[PDB]
Write a protein that binds this ligand. Structure first.
Ligand SMILES: *[C@@H]1O[C@H](CO)[C@@H](O)[C@H](O)[C@H]1NC(C)=O
Ligand SMILES: *[C@@H]1O[C@H](CO)[C@@H](O)[C@H](O)[C@H]1NC(C)=O
Ligand SMILES: *[C@@H]1O[C@H](CO)[C@@H](O)[C@H](O)[C@H]1NC(C)=O
Ligand SMILES: *[C@@H]1O[C@H](CO)[C@@H](O)[C@H](O)[C@H]1NC(C)=O
Ligand SMILES: *[C@@H]1O[C@H](CO)[C@@H](O)[C@H](O)[C@H]1NC(C)=O
Ligand SMILES: *[C@@H]1O[C@H](CO)[C@@H](O)[C@H](O)[C@H]1NC(C)=O
Ligand SMILES: [Ca+2]
Ligand SMILES: [Ca+2]
Ligand SMILES: [Ca+2]
Ligand SMILES: [Ca+2]
Ligand SMILES: [Ca+2]
Lengths: 323, 388, 478, 98
């Protein structure tokens, strides 16, 4: 292992470092991860109204980046271009999806096109980082230790303990959303129960069970298949997480999106591969090899030829020059 | 203070006077009253003008008469926001062995409780007086050698006169002038580590003694690091130019950045720390006008108006009932209303036409003719006109 | 339910007595002298009246410890604070009352530590009275001064000048060495010990001075005075808030106006009231650099100082570390940083806590240039962490009144039977010393002093320059 | 001024052979940017990069004193309780040895 993983997938949902999900429709900034005795950094996430906007990394006291789906990254308040590499924080784009690496400080963040925060974190902070993605321990039941340090039964007030406010805006205790699903039940539970079920039935998902358990994943979906009207695609967010969670454990899965009738969004020219190398051989590139022994990562990428040049796929013949 | 004065002049510190003769100010050495203070989160002040901090969570002693036992005060601390470095005051207890060996309790509102019983203010028993000050803050007064102040949101004060010179013991120190010995545990020795001093005055063994008093909780909340700079940068801005030459501002700045980063809402934590500085600037003589629509101007109700330096003697309707009583009070700051209007019980203030009487406690309406067999009495305009 | 343990008893609130000081007022050792709140007791179990609770053990007797530094001490156990012992004779330590030797300092370029202990800020440029005795209604024995040049903004500049005026003398120092301008009458008490980094400098029974050859000025006084002085360091009375008693005999609040009263040249420049801010000139609006200095100033809270962090508060010495090196543009010499921690390390040593914090990537302080003149490389010199300052030499064979226990710096060490001489950089046997023993009695190595001024008839003088077994004749008055 | 050690009395032999105007412009470029606080290594390293090049042309130099980039060597003669002190910082010793 030697690593970790958190994920804030879909709408309001969370996945800690230890197999513990819940929902949270926040209202302001909240601390994702970071030390508890002493903080060399702090990954932070801003919610506008339940729905998420920005990932932020405050590197102690002096430096700040505020990336988001908007992609218009900024440093403090001055909007900078992209990519960007100050203070040991390469701010890159991998597989058409945005990345923030802090390997000196022991973390790698990223976002996808839809907006799904992810946080990879070393084994150095085992029993350290206490926050909204919980501690990096082995257990999964005890990873609600509040900013006081208090094992709580509620996955909701916990996330509200780890709030952090600014002068631009002070924020309060958000409220749980009053579910309109409770009255508009109808047929929506009888026909659409299958898309949550196919995590368990289909063979392509029928082999991570000795590594993980889909029982929470199917539990968290059935409450979100009810607000969206007329669509099977409402299941693939909770499903899409289950793919990566098994991938991180050392056991990858293949081609599952072929029949799932849901592919994650990407810009033109590319669609969702699975296990593409991060070192995408592009156009204006030096032909060097056997340095990129990095692990294999998911994300959308170009066709077989059709090399990359400035955020699009273009045929190898039309490689430009530069001056 | 970097300015000249002719000979023969006599400037006066708060403590005493000094006179210029042959380029040498002569001065007296007569004692002058001390002031222990609690405020903000956990920021203390000793009688000997020391400052420090101790974020313990238990029932701690604050002051006590220690050669005889005329009184004893006990603070009670709790965590007060999400952070661990935010430990505000909830309630303080007072004890008078000279009267019933009773037990007064100031509560987290502006309320008080004697022996469990809630009480309306005022509370003239024999010695101790308890009354509101601005109708937003309690003020105990036992004898003439003791005062207090509100413990609602935690700004406890005291006032000890020099009759208690050096004969008290507690977190607030000896009241002996010496600023150094104040870390003297009850076991009679000066401790250097504050984390040993505060936990030496706890009252319950089950309470956890702490091990480290952190100084920069803005690390655990990096978002407030910017705001804590520009916010309390006005403390040194020339708005407070008038009382840099009255009292050292550097701690009143140091105790801001520990509060604004730590507490749940930094708005009022800011504007309850600046006032901590102005209140000590005014205790020496310098008033400051530091209120703005941005810098936390309080909202006096529609009946009242904001006021800087005013007279809380001709305000309450009880004053006209007992006009003979002396009001040797200062020129205070708060919410008053114009002189033609005097304060009613129900939040509005009114002319002296419908200002009731408080005869024998009894709240009589503005026209209540009133008599037993042998007396004859009536309430005219606030005063109770009795005859026989 | 639970039948509580034998040594303590279950208690019950009576319906009549409001004073049910039961379980809520759980008397431990901390709270016994203290007074406690109680509304009503609980369904708990509670030690008897003449017994208490102690870390889950109802300790029988009133012998429980007397806590200092949050640590246990049995009754009769002793501690050493300063120059005093102190033992908890019962529950309360009673300490002795031998007042200890106070110590000024000039931490960095522009700060001052008083006797009673009061850090304050004073960037000056004129010449200033560090301390003196001529204060109000006293004779005026000694008049130590200090003089700075280009030191309002700390930098590689700010060479100090120190002129000390005692016994009608004028000895002064700057630029590495000391210089005598007027020798004082009573040469007997005079003494100079160039041990290590420092220039230890006695002047009498109740006076001493130290100088790190670069900036630090740490004058040391004895019990003798006890409010006989004034100046920048204050009055030496124990009271700490009356160390701002200006020359015009009043307490100020803004120390920048304090030192302006104590300057010598009353027509040179009074310093300017700076707008206060947590960032000096360079660090102002350069938040990046502030955090590299902040972190690097947290060596004052590091694993190696953890012993001294308990005794000596580093929060004073920290604020100077961040103040100087912001202003100071350290380029080739990082001495405006390296000197502030040694000023903390020395104070840690005076309390008996040696520290070795100095490595090769961090303020190296070699000592190898001295083992150079001799073609043979005996190399007896060494940067010893904290070695004694008052040792024996060919120039000063006797044991001297020793105001400083140990000091950092380069120190000689060769095998025994070889004693040091400074002129010949190597150590050497005892007999090679120019030592003097005339008519038997043991004394110094031929001091240049005229003994016996008292009695004319008994004027039996015996000088000794280097070794000479000589005795001069006294000139008669008649 | 402090970068004019590259034109000082001790370098006068090497100033003739190796132009210091290149190595000078770096001395002023780095230490402006570099906020030397505790380690003055972004200055001390640029002159050694000039001193070494002076040595390769056969011109040893000893420019390193106690107020200026000291480079002690005393921590090594430490493990042994006996202090033989056989280690030394000196000018320029054979880079190669057995
Ligand atoms: C999002 O990006 C656009 C284009 O740069 C910009 O105009 C807009 O203000 C940004 N909004 C946010 C939420 O930052
Ligand atoms: C984790 O840290 C806690 C709190 O310091 C400690 O009590 C516990 O033993 C640690 N556990 C592990 C597995 O290191
Ligand atoms: C301390 O108290 C003990 C016991 O009463 C007594 O014997 C001793 O003389 C006292 N010492 C001092 C320094 O007061
Ligand atoms: C040098 O320091 C060491 C280690 O503290 C000590 O053992 C030794 O006695 C010292 N020697 C001298 C000559 O001071
Ligand atoms: C000792 O003093 C005498 C004077 O009495 C002088 O002649 C002689 O040279 C001196 N000897 C030495 C070794 O200084
Ligand atoms: C310095 O090193 C040189 C070259 O090895 C050598 O010739 C010389 O003797 C050494 N000098 C000293 C003082 O060690
Ligand atoms: Ca966990
Ligand atoms: Ca005291
Ligand atoms: Ca004093
Ligand atoms: Ca000792
Ligand atoms: Ca050759």
């Amino acid at each position: 292992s030697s690593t970790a993983r958190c994920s804030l997938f879909g709408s309001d949902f969370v996945n800690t470092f230890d197999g513990s999900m819940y929902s949270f429709a926040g209202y302001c900034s909240y601390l994702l991860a970071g030390g508890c005795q002493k903080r060399s950094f702090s990954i932070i996430g801003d919610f506008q109204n339940g729905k998420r906007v920005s990932l932020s990394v405050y590197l102690g006291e002096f430096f700040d980046i505020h990336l988001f789906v908007n992609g218009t990254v900024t440093q403090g308040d001055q909007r900078v271009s992209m990519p960007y590499a100050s203070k040991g924080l390469y701010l890159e784009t991998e597989a058409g999806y945005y990345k923030l690496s802090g390997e000196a400080y022991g973390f790698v963040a990223r976002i996808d096109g839809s907006g799904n925060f992810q946080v990879l974190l070393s084994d150095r902070y085992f029993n350290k980082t206490c926050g909204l993605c919980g501690n990096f321990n082995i257990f999964a039941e005890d990873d609600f230790m509040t900013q006081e340090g208090t094992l709580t039964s509620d996955p909701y007030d916990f996330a509200n303990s780890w709030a952090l406010s600014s002068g631009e805006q002070w924020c309060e205790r958000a409220s749980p959303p009053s579910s309109s699903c409770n009255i508009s039940s109808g047929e929506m539970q009888k026909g659409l129960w299958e898309q949550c079920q196919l995590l368990k039935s289909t063979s392509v998902f029928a082999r991570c069970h000795p590594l993980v358990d889909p029982e929470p994943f199917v539990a968290l979906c059935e409450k979100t298949l009810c607000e969206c009207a007329g669509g099977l695609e409402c299941a693939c967010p909770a499903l899409l997480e289950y793919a990566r969670t098994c991938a991180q454990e050392g056991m990858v899965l293949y081609g599952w999106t072929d029949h799932s009738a849901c592919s994650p969004v990407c810009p033109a020219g590319m669609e969702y591969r699975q296990c593409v190398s991060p070192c995408a051989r592009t156009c204006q590139s030096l032909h060097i090899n056997e340095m990129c022994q990095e692990r294999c990562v998911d994300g959308c990428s170009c066709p077989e030829g059709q090399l990359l040049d400035e955020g699009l796929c273009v045929e190898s013949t039309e490689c430009p020059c530069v001056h | 203070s970097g300015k000249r004065y002719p000979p023969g002049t006599s400037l006066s510190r708060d403590c005493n006077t000094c006179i210029c003769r042959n380029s040498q100010w002569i001065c007296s050495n007569e004692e002058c009253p001390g002031e222990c203070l609690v405020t903000g989160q956990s920021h203390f002040k000793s009688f000997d003008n020391r400052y420090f901090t101790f974020s313990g969570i238990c029932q701690y002693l604050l002051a006590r008469d220690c050669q005889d036992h005329s009184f004893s005060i006990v603070i009670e601390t709790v965590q007060c926001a999400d952070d661990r470095d935010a430990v505000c005051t909830r309630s303080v207890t007072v004890r008078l062995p000279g009267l019933h060996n009773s037990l007064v309790k100031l509560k987290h509102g502006a309320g008080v409780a004697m022996d469990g019983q809630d009480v309306q203010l005022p509370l003239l028993k024999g010695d101790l007086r308890i009354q509101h000050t601005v109708t937003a803050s309690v003020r105990l007064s036992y004898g003439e050698d003791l005062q207090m102040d509100w413990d609602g949101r935690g700004r406890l004060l005291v006032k000890l006169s020099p009759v208690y010179a050096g004969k008290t013991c507690g977190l607030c120190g000896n009241y002996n002038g010496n600023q150094g010995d104040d870390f003297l545990t009850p076991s009679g020795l000066a401790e250097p580590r504050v984390e040993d001093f505060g936990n030496a005055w706890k009252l319950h063994g089950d309470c956890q003694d702490l091990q480290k008093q952190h100084s920069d909780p803005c690390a655990l909340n990096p978002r407030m690091t910017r705001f804590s700079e520009e916010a309390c940068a006005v403390l040194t801005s020339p708005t407070f130019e008038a009382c840099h030459r009255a009292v050292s501002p550097l701690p009143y700045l140091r105790n801001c950045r520990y509060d604004v980063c730590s507490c749940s809402d930094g708005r009022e934590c800011l504007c309850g720390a600046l006032a901590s500085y102005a209140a000590a600037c005014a205790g020496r003589g310098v008033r400051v006008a530091w209120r703005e629509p941005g810098r936390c101007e309080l909202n006096c109700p529609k009946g009242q108006v904001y006021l800087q330096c005013g007279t809380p003697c001709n305000l309450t309707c009880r004053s006209l009932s007992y006009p003979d009583e002396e009001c040797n009070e200062a020129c205070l700051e708060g919410c008053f209303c114009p002189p033609g209007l005097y304060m009613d019980e129900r939040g509005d203030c009114v002319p002296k036409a419908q200002c009731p009487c408080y005869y024998d406690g009894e709240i009589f309406q503005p026209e209540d003719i009133f008599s037993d067999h042998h007396t004859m009495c009536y309430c005219e305009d606030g005063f109770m006109h009795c005859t026989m | 339910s639970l039948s509580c343990r034998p040594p303590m008893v279950k208690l019950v609130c009576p319906a009549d007595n409001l004073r049910a000081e039961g379980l809520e007022c759980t008397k431990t050792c901390q709270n016994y002298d203290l007074e406690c709140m109680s509304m009503g007791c609980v369904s708990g179990c509670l030690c008897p009246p003449g017994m208490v609770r102690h870390e889950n053990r109802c300790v029988a007797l009133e012998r429980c410890p007397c806590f200092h530094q949050g640590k246990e001490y049995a009754p009769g156990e002793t501690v050493k604070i300063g120059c005093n012992t102190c033992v908890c004779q019962d529950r309360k330590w009673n300490c002795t009352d031998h007042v200890c030797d106070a110590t000024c300092s000039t931490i960095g370029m522009a700060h001052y530590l008083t006797f009673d202990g009061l850090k304050y800020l004073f960037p000056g440029e004129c010449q200033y009275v560090l301390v003196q005795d001529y204060c109000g209604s006293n004779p005026g024995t000694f008049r130590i001064l200090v003089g700075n040049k280009g030191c309002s903004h700390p930098s590689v500049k700010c060479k100090k000048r120190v002129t000390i005026l005692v016994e009608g003398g004028e000895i002064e120092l700057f630029d590495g060495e000391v210089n005598v301008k007027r020798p004082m009458k009573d040469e007997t008490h005079f003494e100079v010990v160039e041990s290590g980094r420092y220039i230890i400098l006695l002047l009498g029974k109740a006076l001493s001075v130290v100088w790190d050859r670069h900036l630090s000025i740490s004058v040391v006084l004895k019990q003798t005075y006890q409010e006989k002085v004034c100046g920048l360091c204050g009055n030496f009375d124990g009271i700490q808030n009356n160390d701002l008693t200006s020359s015009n005999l009043q307490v100020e609040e803004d120390p920048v106006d304090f030192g302006n009263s104590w300057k010598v040249s009353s027509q040179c420049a009074d310093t300017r009231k700076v707008p206060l801010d947590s960032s000096p000139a360079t660090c102002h609006n350069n938040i990046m650099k502030q955090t590299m200095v902040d972190s690097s100033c947290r060596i004052l809270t590091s694993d190696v100082f953890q012993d001294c962090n308990k005794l000596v508060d580093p929060e004073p010495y920290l604020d100077v570390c961040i103040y100087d090196t912001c202003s100071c543009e350290s380029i080739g010499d990082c001495a405006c940083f390296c000197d502030t921690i040694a000023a903390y390390a020395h104070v840690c040593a005076q309390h008996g806590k040696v520290v070795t914090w100095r490595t090769a990537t961090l303020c190296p302080q070699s000592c190898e240039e001295r083992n150079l003149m001799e073609n043979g490389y005996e190399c007896m010199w060494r940067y010893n962490s904290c070695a004694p300052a008052c040792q024996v030499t060919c120039q000063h064979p006797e044991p001297l009144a020793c105001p400083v226990q140990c000091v950092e710096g380069c120190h000689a060490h060769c095998p025994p039977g070889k004693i040091l001489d400074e002129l010949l950089q190597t150590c050497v046997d005892p007999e090679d010393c120019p030592v003097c023993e005339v008519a038997g009695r043991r004394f110094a190595s031929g001091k240049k002093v005229t003994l016996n001024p008292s009695d004319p008839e008994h004027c039996q003088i015996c000088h000794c320059d280097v070794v000479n077994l000589t005795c001069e004749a006294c000139q008669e008055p008649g």
